Write a protein that binds this ligand. Structure first.
Ligand code: MG
Lengths: 49, 241, 119
RNA sequence: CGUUGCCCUCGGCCGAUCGAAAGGGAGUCGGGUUCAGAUCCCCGAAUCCGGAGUGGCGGAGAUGGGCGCCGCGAGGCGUCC
RNA sequence: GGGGGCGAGCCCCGAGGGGCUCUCGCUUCUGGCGCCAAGCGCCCGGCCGCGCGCCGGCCGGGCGCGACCCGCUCCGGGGACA
């Protein structure tokens, strides 16, 4: 991402209301990689990214 | 048999992250247009703020059975409509030069409508009963009226619907209504209503004057307070007692 | 008992009516001022214009600047009872839209040229 | 069968609009022709895009397999998928 | 607020169960799929057969649950100070 030292991560979820694959731009946690899953919420497991 | 094997169930788990959620009602979480949103949160302010008693008294409206008596009694004394007005004039013009024209005959009694027609005939003690509407749009038109009524000793009630009060007359709304007189046949009915009315309104006007009544909270907050009170209660009740 | 499925509240699709004018604003319609005539001003008779006529089966006109090829075609057909293959307009640096008009091969251009006056 | 009126049914967007003869952007080339124009005129070969209703025509969809009869046999009919 | 119950803590219990408190609203091994309802329940229009037709078949629809109920600020965080 030009003008930024951090790399980003296109992370795609599934909208839970419309059949539709919503996507985001997270700033990449170091040790993230592609074909990884990225869980998020209250009951999220305490691992990286 | 009349039961296909093939037919299955196929039930959908509406979990989290599972089968995409069903199209449930969202009436609560809709984003409303700024007119709607306002009229709703005007009503709330009236409940949330400390409403003073001259305005609060209009919450205390008449009870269903009494209202249906009143509207039945008024059905006798609705004012003359159009067409009726023409027929009253037309019959008189024919009778003048035909078979003796007296002129004044004898006019029946009828309702008195707008605040100004009424307030003169509470100043003048011409009224026997006064009905007021509870939902006049700028309140100030009808605020003094019940205090003025109680000063002059005129039984007054507050009915629901400036519209339904105004449908006695044949105009959209009406603020007030009043009976100056009533026919001898219907006389005892009015006097039955009157006494029942003044018990509930004019003969407790001191309690009305003092009775403030907004100052409620949002149930969502009320419930939060009660839960804390149950925590404070269980902190010092089950321990000792 | 009609539930809001969606959290938006879009404006409802009201009835809307056609115009039913209690009177017509303008008394009667404007007459067309770009007729079969007013579209074709005159024929060129220039050396280059006659060479076009004699060799290419065309007639070379000056035309009203507002005209489409469609209109010219229709005018040329109407005035001279003729029939066109194609119209091929340009604008002169002078202001007068010129038009080269190829007549269909059943017709000779020099024959019509003699009919209309030019040669 | 169209065309429209009404009723229901469905529909996220994202900002109206303007902004490039060098950005993006379907499809045209050879020969001839003029005092001065040519991928533009003429000759010849093409090509895209839109329409094509009543569908203009072919071809594809699609013309199997079974069983029952009758026929020397090629086959014909009846009936089942 | 109740339902639901796999279950856990407590209380009751007649060991069948009930109540309060928690818990979920149920998805973590893989660079998949995932919407426009199955299922059940109750109604009607037409057609056909039994003929008593909300009996049975054929064709076509509607509503309810499925997908608890009620409520007054959309949800958060501030806040009588900014
Ligand atoms: Mg532009």
């Amino acid at each position: 991402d030009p003008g930024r030292g951090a790399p980003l991560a296109k992370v795609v979820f599934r909208d839970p209301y419309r059949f539709k694959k919503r996507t985001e731009l997270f700033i990449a946690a170091e040790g993230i990689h592609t074909g990884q899953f990225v869980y998020c919420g209250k009951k999220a497991q305490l691992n990286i990214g | 048999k009349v039961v296909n094997p093939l037919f299955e169930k196929r039930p959908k788990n509406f979990g989290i992250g599972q089968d995409i959620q069903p199209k449930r009602d969202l009436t609560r979480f809709v984003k409303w247009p700024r007119y709607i949103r306002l009229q709703r949160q005007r009503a709330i302010l009236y409940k949330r703020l400390k409403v003073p008693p001259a305005i609060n008294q209009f919450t205390q409206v008449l009870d269903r059975q009494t209202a249906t008596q009143l509207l039945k009694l008024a059905h006798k004394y609705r004012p003359e409509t159009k067409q009726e007005k023409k027929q009253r004039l037309l019959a008189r013009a024919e009778k003048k030069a035909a078979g003796k024209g007296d002129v004044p005959t004898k006019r029946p009694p009828v309702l008195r409508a707008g605040v100004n027609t009424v307030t003169t005939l509470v100043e003048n003690k011409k009224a026997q009963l006064v009905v007021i509407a509870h939902d006049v749009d700028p309140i100030e038109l009808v605020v003094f009226l019940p205090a003025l009524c109680r000063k002059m000793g005129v039984p007054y009630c507050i009915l629901k619907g400036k519209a339904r009060l105004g449908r006695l007359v044949h105009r959209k709304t009406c603020t007030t209504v009043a009976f100056t007189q009533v026919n001898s046949e219907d006389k005892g009915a009015l006097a039955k209503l009157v006494e029942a009315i003044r018990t509930n309104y004019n003969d407790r006007y001191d309690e009305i004057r003092r009775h403030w009544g907004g100052n409620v909270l949002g149930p969502k907050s009320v419930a939060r307070i009660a839960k804390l009170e149950k925590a404070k209660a269980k902190e010092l009740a089950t321990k000792l007692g | 008992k009609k539930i809001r499925t969606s959290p938006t509240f879009r404006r409802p699709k009201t009835l809307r009516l056609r115009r039913q004018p209690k009177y017509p604003r303008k008394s009667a319609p404007r007459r067309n001022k770009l007729d079969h005539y007013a579209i074709i001003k005159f024929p060129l008779t220039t050396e280059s214009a006659m060479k076009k006529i004699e060799d290419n089966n065309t007639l070379v006109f000056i035309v009203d600047v507002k005209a489409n090829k469609h209109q010219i075609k229709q005018a040329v057909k109407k005035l001279y009872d003729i029939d066109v293959a194609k119209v091929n307009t340009l604008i002169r640096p002078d202001g007068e839209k010129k038009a080269y008009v190829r007549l269909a091969p059943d017709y000779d251009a020099l024959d019509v040229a003699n009919k209309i006056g030019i040669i």
